[PDB]
Structure 1
Amino acid sequence: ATKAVCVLKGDGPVQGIINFEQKESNGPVKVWGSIKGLTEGLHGFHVHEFGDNTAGCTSAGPHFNPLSRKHGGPKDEERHVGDLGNVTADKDAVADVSIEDSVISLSGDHCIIGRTLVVHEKADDLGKGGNEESTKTGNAGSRLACGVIGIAQ
């Protein structure tokens, strides 16, 4: 089994730890952990292309999209590899993250190791929004916290 880990940090109150586990090379990736300091509601949750934090989360670039697809939700065929949908925060400002995804990987051309995980200001509309930006970013707003996805023990 392969494992990875990401420490989310930013300029404000948002911080988290996210774990990745892939039992088999061809298999789904379990994503789990916790994020604190979030407003109640949905927050866009994406793997962005670059593991570049030189200028904070802006340097991470666009959604990781090795197959040149449009933006969607994790359960859509038409999605970026990086499209992990939304995490949900309650009034406690905590999002408990528990995802299984078949499109990201910890090896090969879908590999997310060395790329950046970002949690966003607003909801990702999963490409179903009423504008052009829906099909590109999902209108999830600014980047609250991010980290480079690293190889774990």
Structure 2
Amino acid sequence: ATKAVCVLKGDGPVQGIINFEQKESNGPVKVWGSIKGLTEGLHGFHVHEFGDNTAGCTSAGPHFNPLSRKHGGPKDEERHVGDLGNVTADKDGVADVSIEDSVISLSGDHCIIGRTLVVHEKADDLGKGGNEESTKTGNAGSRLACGVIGIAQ
């Protein structure tokens, strides 16, 4: 696949549509779209391991981290495959997403099709929050909305 899409929903008002496009299988993945219903400010934006929503967002499990690294920000050498940093919500709760990543893929081992995209309660501290939880989830807190990443037309 060269295109993917994720519909984000949760227990509250957080909702959105996130697009994915990868023209070359060894090139970067463009990640774009919008999320509404967030509090103003920074929110962690991660690919979690499982495309399992049986129990809500919790069933998606830990961060997608097949190379077993500690948590970092997208520009860090050391980070999970699923570490896409933070998205930024405006005063109206709207976060416009426009990201380009070369670690995630729409194919092969780093393939995220069938996994889960999650927008978190708080800002992802990129591994520099200065405690143990920081080197794991970036202290991004709870799962506000999620969706299984699906093959798109």
Q: TM-score, normalised by structure 2?
A: 0.99
**SS of structure 2 residue aligned to 1:117:** strand
CA deviation vs aligned residue, 1:44-69 (integer Å, no higher than 9, x gap): 00000000000000000000001010
Q: Distance in 2 between matches of 1:113 and 1:39?
A: 28
Q: Distance in 1 between matches of 2:52 and 2:11?
A: 16
Q: Which residue of 2 aligns with 1:56?
A: 56
CA deviation vs aligned residue, 1:5-28 (integer Å, no higher than 9, x gap): 000000000000000000100000
Q: Distance in 2 between matches of 1:141 and 1:66?
A: 22
Deviation (angstroms), 1:130: 1.1
Q: Distance in 2 between matches of 1:72 and 1:109?
A: 20
Stretches of structure 2 lacking an aligned partner (at least 5 in a row): none
**SS of structure 1 residue aligned to 2:137:** coil
CA deviation vs aligned residue, 1:92-112 (integer Å, no higher than 9, x gap): 110000000000000000000
Count of paired positions: 153
Q: Which residue of 1 aligns with 2:95?
A: 95
| Percent identity between the two aligned chains | 99
**SS of structure 2 residue aligned to 1:58:** helix
CA deviation vs aligned residue, 1:35-94 (integer Å, no higher than 9, x gap): 000000000000000000000000000000010100000000000000000000011110
Q: Distance in 1 between matches of 2:13 and 2:120?
A: 13
**SS of structure 2 residue aligned to 1:20:** strand
Q: Distance in 2 between matches of 1:101 and 1:127?
A: 18
Q: Distance in 2 between matches of 1:132 and 1:11?
A: 28
**SS of structure 2 residue aligned to 1:31:** strand
Deviation (angstroms), 1:33: 0.3
Deviation (angstroms), 1:134: 0.6
Deviation (angstroms), 1:138: 0.3
Q: Distance in 2 between matches of 1:130 and 1:77?
A: 18
Q: CA RMSD in A?
A: 0.6
Q: Distance in 1 between matches of 2:73 and 2:117?
A: 16
- The 4+ residue runs of structure 1 with deviation greater than 3 A are none
Q: Distance in 2 between matches of 1:78 and 1:129?
A: 15
Q: Which residue of 2 aligns with 1:44?
A: 44
Q: Distance in 2 between matches of 1:108 and 1:127?
A: 27
